[PDB]
């Protein structure tokens, strides 16, 4: 039975409050996904989501706020860039980019943040572990 | 190996403790690289926890301390208060949520599980906190002066709201006066009081107040700084008359403008009048209207032929300079509160309205200066064709509005449809049998007491046409205007036959406001008009910081509307100044210059334009104002180099979570 | 001429309420801030989403509502009323009936004299209560406890308890222990505090629609009104965000919207004024109905669509974009099907002038609003005097909104007729900046 390894890095107004909102409405997810909490997502470097998928990542997942609802106004769309440009890159290197992906859930929104570790889960069994740990890294 | 770090966890009352083997947990936090002690307890927000976390500080002497309980946006605040009362600094405490996302979405089945997801969530938490570091709070002095721009009445509020805080205020106005749109209003919407007469009582209060300094006839000519400190440079406009204070500073003893009137009986020169939209004569030196606050008779400059009759006809008083030019003046203020109104939409354009082509189509501005008794007539509405009174006037409502052609204006001026009924009820109040027609289209009386208004102009005996105007003709021998549309309620053609045509013509901001939001970094909106710092629960404030709206520069709005976000804005800028301190945030971002380049790419990705360009120790590097930053984390995020440190979230801080969440 | 309190009140702790403590509190002035429900949030806690931004309630709400709990110059009083008021501009002797809240809070547990904390929330006696009563927050439509809470978000999470319907087992009380959070036989308490100025923001309520026969509201299943479609329509609602028929729990494929329900009426039952956000819910409802079922239609028979502030006319323009079919004409009555409880709307389409027979499978109200129950009687203790339309009466209906003729007094929100949001936190900066003068200057002439 082998364990997938799922880092989160979620943003502390709407991520983190729609995750802490799933735990008090009792709604229930596997336990897979473990959390960062940065303050905007906008934070995130793309060094992060490298560093995260070499030392032996095998999905990552970085949850924001919808555009238009950031609370500094526009971290997500510097973001959405950078992690576009991280998609490009995990498929030139030979990557599977389907193991990285980033959402936008709000704060209002439980229910969304237990489908998606669900649908994160099931993905990341689906496509095993990853090449990079059986290739000396 | 400095670091020693003390690990506490709560059952929670077997809310955690009935999903995961918190011995486990302790056990497991009893063997991480830095821990120090590691403890469990059924309750830790309450009183005997914070006595427990300082018992520990005080007899392991922690660098720092681990909790693992709920969430952080629940109990940050308690137990950072909790470390701080221990003698540790508030922000070296870090915090695992093993309630809200781990013991409560893992209850059923899933035992083994949530242990280990616990200790993974323990080992990241103690593995920040390692490399956790002391956070002083520090905040920026505030300069105790206030500056509002725009005289009218927005500005006006503001000013008295700011001076009766006990705030000395400067009350910036373009214009001579400063009444504003307000003082070119013969009533006011639904309440029908003298515009003027309800004005004139503040008019006076904001000239008489001690704590208001009214420069009228200037502008702001640059700004500088941010939200502590705003650096402004204003030019003062060469007004050609001195005040009475002014005349004493100069020398002479003569009063300056005690406002005789002398001068302008005696004036060569007649210009069209800006207050009366162009419709009343005036000289060189003149006031716009007899109810001015400063009664001081600006001279127009670019008018006045230098013939030197005023002079005698102000002897012994010496009020006139004629060869005085603008002045500049550096004023040190706190905070800023923009209140730069509007302005009437060009309405020449969309030619079917034949606003310039035709004599007798006007304005709504038009309509209350020709039927103000103040007005270049006695108040006698008169067709401007032959000066003869009219029987029958239309209303054209929406002109130039709602509007997605490309010429006007695809919004709503909010306020063109209770003006036009307050027009209608005037012409049949002052004319008698005469008879109104307003051709609406969407009737939109919103406001308190405006439905009831609009009852009674109906009751009046006011004709409404739903129908949009489709064109306009006039009769060359008579200059009557046809108005051609549909009732679409009736469904037919109809052309209206009537003696004066009023166009509710849409607004937009006043002529240089554009540059002047430039100026202080405000952005504006889609529609053009300077946008909120959040539409919904900020509509006074702005992204810029130490910077606040008031008015219809914010968009078109009452005058009870309006007066209601000056009082606001006026708190929201007093708030800083009576606290005397802005504090900044716990988490603002840090150059260090010893590794910056000076690229410069981070300057446009800060929505706040808190980042900026100068120069240190000769090399050109990045320089933060703290007061503008707010721990959003962008531009660490982004730069290359590391340069920026994003304290309490620093790269090697979150590396170091990454990095123990892959390890044993 | 006469010395001010350093301290000011605020009554209501919605938005408005909320904004002008804020505000208060940051220019240092220690204020009181007296709800009569358990938690703060007020009405805009009830709204899924906001127009025209279609922004999230409660995310913009909750960073303000974890404020005004932490602010340590704020006193925040929920569950409380004001019982009297005497006194003037200078020193306000306001007596505050505590109502018994059943549930102890940490401060309050401490003073006591027990070590044990006062309910840090944990959820567990709701849990057991046998007692099943309708949500006045969701209003009638889902379950709660005898001891309870409004909702999750709620500011101060405390879980008070309904001693009109406890039976008083003492069943919580096991499920609390070693808390002794639950005291089941506490009372009133009477306190007396001296404020130098007080800013009413006591909100409003829904007009009664029960009348207006023609409209079966109360008749037919069906039928709803705008609040009860926000909470129904909300994620954290009755059910999972899914508008659902009362009737028969399948979902609608058809809603009608019915604006100026008992509004702009000369005929004694209604009311005559416009509540001047009707239009734009409606709007907002219509959108989310077609967002959120798809295939579904928004009809909305309308008279003077009236969308007049700050990106409203946008909102109505996207709103017909999406497919929103507007009908111009007020409906004339409602009937039923027998069978399938489908709701006949009667009116004429004035435009293209005929009349009109639509089915909905859902029909939604957008009743007028009124000032809230007991409005009237604290409106009297602080000597305000009423509107012709019965609001609250502002000093001067131009130059002084806020104000009132009452000295140190003053006016924020709905209370003083109906607003959108950003208005009614505009009056509420405005209120709380008149406030702050007396008590900034230390002193007041009269
Ligand atoms: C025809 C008409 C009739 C109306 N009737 C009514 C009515 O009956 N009732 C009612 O409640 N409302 C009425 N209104 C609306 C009312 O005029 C506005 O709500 C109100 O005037 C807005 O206040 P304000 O001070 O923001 O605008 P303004 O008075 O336009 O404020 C702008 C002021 O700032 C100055 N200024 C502008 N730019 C600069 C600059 N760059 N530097 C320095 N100073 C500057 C201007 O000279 C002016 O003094 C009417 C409007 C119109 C057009
Ligand atoms: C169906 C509907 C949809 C809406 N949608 C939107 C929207 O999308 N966007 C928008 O901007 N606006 C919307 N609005 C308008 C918005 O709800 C109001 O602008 C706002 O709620 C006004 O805030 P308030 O604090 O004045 O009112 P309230 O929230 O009602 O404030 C009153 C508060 O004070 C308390 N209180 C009352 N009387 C007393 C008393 N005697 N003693 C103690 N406490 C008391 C009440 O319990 C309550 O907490 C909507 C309104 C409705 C009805
Ligand atoms: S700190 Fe959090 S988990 Fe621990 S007892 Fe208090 S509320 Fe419960
Ligand atoms: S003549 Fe002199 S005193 Fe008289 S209005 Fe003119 S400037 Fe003023
Ligand atoms: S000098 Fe200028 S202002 Fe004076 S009277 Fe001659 S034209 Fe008029
Ligand atoms: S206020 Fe009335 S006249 Fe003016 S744009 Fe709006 S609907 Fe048209
Ligand atoms: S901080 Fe980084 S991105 Fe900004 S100018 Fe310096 S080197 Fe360039
Ligand atoms: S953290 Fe955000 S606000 Fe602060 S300097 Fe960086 S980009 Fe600007
Ligand atoms: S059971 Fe006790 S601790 Fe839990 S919510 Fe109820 S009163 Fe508070
Ligand atoms: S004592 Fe009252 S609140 Fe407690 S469980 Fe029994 S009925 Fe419910
Ligand atoms: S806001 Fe719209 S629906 Fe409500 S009363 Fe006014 S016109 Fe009717
Ligand atoms: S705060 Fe969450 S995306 Fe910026």
Redesign the interface.
């Known amino acids: 039975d082998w364990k997938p390894?799922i880092?989160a890095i979620i943003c502390?107004?709407?991520s983190?409050?729609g995750?802490?909102?799933?735990?008090?409405?009792?709604?229930?997810?596997?336990?897979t996904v473990?959390?960062?909490?940065?303050?905007?997502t906008?934070?995130?470097?793309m060094?992060?989501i490298l560093?995260?998928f070499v030392?032996?990542?095998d999905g990552v997942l970085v949850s924001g706020c919808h555009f238009?609802?950031c609370?500094?106004?526009?971290?997500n769309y510097?973001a959405a860039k950078?992690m576009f440009m991280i998609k490009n890159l995990l498929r030139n290197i030979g990557l599977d980019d389907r193991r990285f992906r980033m959402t936008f859930v709000?704060?209002?929104?439980g229910?969304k943040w237990?489908m998606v570790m669900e649908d994160v889960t099931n993905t990341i069994k689906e496509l095993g572990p990853s090449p990079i740990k059986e290739f000396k890294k | 190996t400095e670091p020693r770090i003390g690990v506490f966890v709560c059952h929670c009352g077997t809310n955690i403790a009935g999903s995961m083997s918190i011995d486990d947990v302790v056990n497991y936090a009893k063997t991480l690289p830095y821990v120090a002690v590691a403890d469990q307890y059924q309750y830790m927000c309450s009183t005997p926890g914070q006595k427990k976390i300082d018992d520990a500080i005080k007899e392991y002497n922690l660098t720092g301390v681990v909790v693992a309980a709920c969430?952080?946006?629940?109990h940050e605040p308690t137990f950072r208060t909790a470390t701080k009362e221990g003698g540790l600094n508030p922000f070296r405490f870090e915090m695992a949520?093993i309630?809200?996302?781990?013991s409560?979405?893992?209850?059923?089945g899933?035992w083994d599980?949530?242990t280990?997801?616990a200790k993974?969530?323990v080992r990241?938490a103690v593995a920040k906190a390692a490399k956790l570091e002391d956070l002083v709070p520090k905040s920026v002095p505030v300069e105790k002066t206030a500056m509002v721009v725009g005289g009218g009445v927005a500005g006006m509020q503001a000013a008295l709201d700011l001076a009766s805080a006990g705030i000395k205020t400067y009350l910036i106005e373009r214009t001579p006066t400063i009444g504003g749109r307000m003082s070119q209003l013969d009533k006011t919407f639904p309440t029908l009081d003298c515009s003027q007469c309800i004005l004139t009582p503040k008019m006076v209060d904001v000239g008489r107040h001690p704590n208001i300094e009214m420069m009228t006839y200037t502008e702001v000519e640059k700004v500088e700084g941010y939200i502590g400190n705003f650096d402004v440079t204003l030019r003062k406009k060469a007004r050609g008359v001195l005040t009475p204070t002014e005349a004493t500073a100069k020398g002479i003893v003569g009063g300056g403008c005690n406002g005789c009137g002398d001068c302008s009986a005696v004036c060569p020169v007649i210009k069209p009048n800006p207050f009366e939209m162009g419709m009343a004569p005036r000289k060189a030196i003149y006031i716009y209207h007899a109810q001015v606050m400063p009664l001081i008779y600006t001279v127009d400059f670019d008018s006045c032929v230098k013939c030197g009759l005023c002079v005698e006809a102000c002897g012994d008083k010496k009020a006139i300079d004629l060869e005085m030019q603008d002045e500049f003046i550096t004023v040190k203020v706190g905070t800023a509160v923009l209140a730069t109104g509007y302005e009437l939409f060009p309405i020449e354009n969309k030619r079917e309205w034949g606003y310039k082509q035709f004599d007798n189509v006007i304005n709504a501005l038009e309509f209350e200066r020709l039927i103000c008794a103040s007005g270049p007539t006695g108040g006698h509405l008169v067709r401007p064709s032959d000066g003869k009174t009219p029987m029958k006037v239309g209303f054209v409502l929406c002109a130039g509005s709602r509007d997605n052609t490309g010429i006007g204006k695809p919004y709503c001026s909010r306020f063109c449809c209770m003006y036009s009924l307050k027009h209608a009820h005037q012409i049949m109040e002052k004319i008698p049998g005469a008879v109104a027609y307003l051709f609406y289209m969407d009737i939109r009386s919103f406001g308190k007491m405006y439905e009831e208004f609009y009852y009674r102009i109906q009751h009046e005996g006011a004709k409404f046409i739903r129908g949009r105007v489709a064109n306009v003709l006039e009769d060359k021998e008579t200059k009557n205007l046809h108005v051609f549309t549909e009732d679409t309620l009736l469904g037919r053609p109809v052309d209206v036959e009537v003696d004066l045509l009023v166009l509710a013509a849409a607004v937009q901001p006043n002529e240089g406001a554009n540059e002047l939001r430039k100026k202080f970094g405000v952005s504006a909106s889609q529609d053009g008009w300077m946008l909120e710092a959040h539409p919904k629960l900020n509509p006074c404030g702005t992204?810029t910081a130490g910077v606040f709206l008031a008015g219809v520069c914010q968009g078109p709005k009452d005058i009870p509307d309006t007066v209601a976000q000056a009082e606001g804005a006026a708190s929201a800028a007093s708030i800083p100044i009576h606290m005397g301190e802005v504090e900044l945030e716990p988490?603002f971002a840090m150059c260090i210059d010893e590794l910056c380049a000076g690229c410069g790419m981070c300057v446009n990705?800060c929505?706040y334009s808190a980042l900026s360009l100068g120069e240190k120790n000769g090399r050109t590097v990045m320089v933060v104002t703290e007061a503008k930053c707010?721990?959003?984390?962008?531009c660490?995020?982004?730069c290359p180099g590391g340069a920026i440190k994003?304290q309490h979230?620093t790269?090697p801080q979150?590396?170091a979570?990454?990095?123990a969440?892959?390890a044993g």
């Open positions: 390894q880092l502390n107004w709407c983190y409050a995750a802490d909102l799933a735990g008090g409405a009792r709604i229930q997810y596997p336990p473990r959390a960062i909490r940065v303050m905007c906008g934070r995130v470097d060094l992060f560093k995260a030392e032996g990542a238009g609802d609370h500094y106004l526009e971290g510097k950078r709000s704060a209002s929104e229910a237990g | 969430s952080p946006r629940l949520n309630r809200e996302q781990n409560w979405v893992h209850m059923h899933m599980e949530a280990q997801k993974d969530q990241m992204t988490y990705l929505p707010k721990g959003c984390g962008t660490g995020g982004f994003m979230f790269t979150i590396v979570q990454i990095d969440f892959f």
